[PDB]
């Protein structure tokens, strides 16, 4: 289980524990998965998506049953295999981001570019630049949100945790059905209860009994 990000990432002055990343509460390193919506024209191939998220094109290709050079239709959700490891008490997958245009902000990078796979707070925590002092060409360390199964999760047969970007009209019920797991397992993975609010566009952890499907 990890705490639910719970829209705390929408305000850069928010300092809730969850905005700084999943907490290192299990094994030091593991296979994990991100999800990401293909965006044209910058991030719509395995090479460009893997460049943004620091995966490999072949891992993205095999995870989605495509070739490593196939274009991906815009808004297609793709799974991205990543290594998840502990760093300073947090689970995260490290990536790098070179700012393209002056005008980008810590929030625009977390919310738009990385589609809430990281947060304003974590970017600011792990980068020396001031929020007012970002420019085109600056290199940013990007802590992407991932986690490793706890002993209790592993004992129940969950081999991976997947970071799922929730879309409009989805619910814990519908998301669990995509991955062949019980709804309660998804709630438990995010320390939610049957009577909780889940937000569109916020990452949600999904425990997996096997590798995710090739198409979501």
């Amino acid at each position: 289980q990890q705490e639910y990000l719970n829209n705390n990432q929408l305000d850069c002055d928010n300092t809730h524990n969850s905005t700084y990343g999943n907490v290192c509460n299990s094994v030091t390193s593991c296979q994990s998965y991100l999800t990401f919506k293909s965006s044209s024209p910058e991030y719509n191939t395995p090479s460009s998506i893997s460049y943004l998220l620091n995966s490999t094109p072949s891992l993205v290709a095999k995870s989605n049953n495509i070739t490593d050079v196939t274009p991906i239709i815009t808004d297609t959700m793709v799974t991205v295999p990543v290594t998840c490891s502990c760093s300073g008490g947090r689970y995260q997958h490290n990536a790098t981001y070179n700012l393209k245009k002056t005008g980008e902000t810590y929030f625009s990078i977390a919310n738009n570019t990385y589609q809430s796979l990281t947060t304003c707070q974590a970017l600011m925590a792990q980068n020396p630049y001031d929020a007012k002092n970002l420019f085109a060409g600056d290199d940013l360390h990007v802590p992407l949100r991932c986690a490793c199964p706890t002993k209790k999760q592993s004992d129940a047969g969950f081999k991976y945790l997947l970071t799922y970007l929730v879309s409009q009209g989805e619910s814990p019920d519908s998301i669990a059905e995509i991955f062949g797991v019980d709804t309660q397992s998804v709630l438990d993975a995010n320390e939610l209860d049957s009577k909780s609010v889940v937000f569109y566009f916020t990452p949600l952890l999904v425990p997996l009994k096997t590798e995710p499907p090739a198409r979501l």
Partner: nanobody
Amino acid sequence: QLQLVESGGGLVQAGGSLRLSCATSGTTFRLNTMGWYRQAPGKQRELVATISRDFKTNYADSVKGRFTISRDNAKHTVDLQMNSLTPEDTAVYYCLVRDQREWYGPEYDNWGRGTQVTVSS
């Protein structure tokens, strides 16, 4: 969409107190202002207190000092502590939750089914 569950009303002696609470569940993009309204017999549904996500409050004049609104952003609940009640506080009390379903989209009213509060003479 969103489901609201109100609790904590009932019958109370004048001068007594009650605690109303409302829990929200379901899905949305953002939960904005939450609040409590009331409709006395023969009256309109009128604002009692609201509270924003950043805890900015707004109280009806007839209610300032006696009532206190609170908000739990971890579990998405809103509570109304009602002290020094009078028969003029007898009403059906409704929780209001405002939500948005996309970035910069319209805001929607979500109303609970209402909880009866009756204050005896």
